[PDB]
Amino acid sequence: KQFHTGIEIKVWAIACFAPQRQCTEVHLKSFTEQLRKISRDAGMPIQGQPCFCKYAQGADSVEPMFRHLKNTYAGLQLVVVILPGKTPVYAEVKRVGDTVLGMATQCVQMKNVQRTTPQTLSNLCLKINVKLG
């Protein structure tokens, strides 16, 4: 689809369902910085500092976390969710985000947070653009 202008993502969260020992804090910070720069250059700036960034484990942690996020951060525009491979977490994120709380979520694979490429970051921005468009 066509790119939408005028999006600024100022309030957003990271929920990392990948294990910290696999997807460390510096991996998260590096990924976030790369995402900040390309979204900016593309004209849909995602601000560099998320309002929240935490690790969690298992699909059962999703609903309590997203409820917490909704109850805590006014103006929340997006939750970026990092998945460790193929996992029931994805289905739960979408159930809770799309059909329970009306919260925009974008999932990303752990391997693409550990090592980014402009192309994978581009895929992400485009998915995000469509969602908040």
Swiss-Prot record:
Lineage top rank: taxon: Eukaryota
PTMs per UniProt: Hydroxylated. 4-hydroxylation appears to enhance protein stability but is not required for miRNA-binding or endonuclease activity.
Region (Interaction with guide RNA) location: 85-127
Effect of F66V: No effect on miRNA-binding or target mRNA cleavage. Abrogates binding to the 7-methylguanosine cap of mRNA and prevents inhibition of translation and abolishes interaction with TNRC6C
Localisation per UniProt entry: Cytoplasm, P-body; Nucleus
Consequence when changing F31W: No effect on binding to the 7-methylguanosine cap of mRNA or inhibition of translation
UniProt function note: Required for RNA-mediated gene silencing (RNAi) by the RNA-induced silencing complex (RISC). The 'minimal RISC' appears to include AGO2 bound to a short guide RNA such as a microRNA (miRNA) or short interfering RNA (siRNA). These guide RNAs direct RISC to complementary mRNAs that are targets for RISC-mediated gene silencing. The precise mechanism of gene silencing depends on the degree of complementarity between the miRNA or siRNA and its target. Binding of RISC to a perfectly complementary mRNA generally results in silencing due to endonucleolytic cleavage of the mRNA specifically by AGO2. (Microbial infection) Upon Sars-CoV-2 infection, associates with viral miRNA-like small RNA, CoV2-miR-O7a, and may repress mRNAs, such as BATF2, to evade the IFN response.
Subunit (UniProt): Interacts with DICER1 through its Piwi domain and with TARBP2 during assembly of the RNA-induced silencing complex (RISC). Together, DICER1, AGO2 and TARBP2 constitute the trimeric RISC loading complex (RLC), or micro-RNA (miRNA) loading complex (miRLC). Within the RLC/miRLC, DICER1 and TARBP2 are required to process precursor miRNAs (pre-miRNAs) to mature miRNAs and then load them onto AGO2. AGO2 bound to the mature miRNA constitutes the minimal RISC and may subsequently dissociate from DICER1 and TARBP2. Note however that the term RISC has also been used to describe the trimeric RLC/miRLC.
Domain-related comment: The Piwi domain may perform RNA cleavage by a mechanism similar to that of RNase H. However, while RNase H utilizes a triad of Asp-Asp-Glu (DDE) for metal ion coordination, this protein appears to utilize a triad of Asp-Asp-His (DDH).
Family statement drawn from the similarity comment of this UniProt entry: Belongs to the argonaute family. Ago subfamily.
This protein's name: Protein argonaute-2
Residues of the full protein shown: 440 to 572 of 859
